[PDB]
């Protein structure tokens with residue numbers, strides 16, 4: 001297919017933020033994937049999106065901010081998880097929660 005051997009047509013080129021997932025051959029077209037530090041945005045991978053910051057998680061529709069009351073301290077990986085509930089643990093709140101940081105509970109009251 002890169003030399004004219006035509007259903008085979010013209011080969012896709014994977015450059016920049018794209019690299020080759022599957023190389024082109026006589027039987028099939030080349031397939032792209034996103035470079036490390038990036039992920040496919042949409043089902044066909046027409047765009048790449050930068051891996052998510054802390055305070056976000058990777059969904060099927062790209063990076064999304066953690067919903068209020070959840071956090072993700074990891075950069076480029078992990079899931080938004082609920083804040084520690086100090087009250088259920090018999091403790092009080094010493095430092096409040098954020099999208100990036102869990103609540104810090106105090107000593108046993």
Ligand SMILES: *[C@@H]1O[C@H](CO)[C@@H](O)[C@H](O)[C@H]1NC(C)=O
Pocket residue numbers: 084085086087088
């Ligand atoms: C902890 O969970 C209890 C039980 O549902 C609830 O009363 C309390 O408001 C919760 N607090 C936080 C900070 O999540």
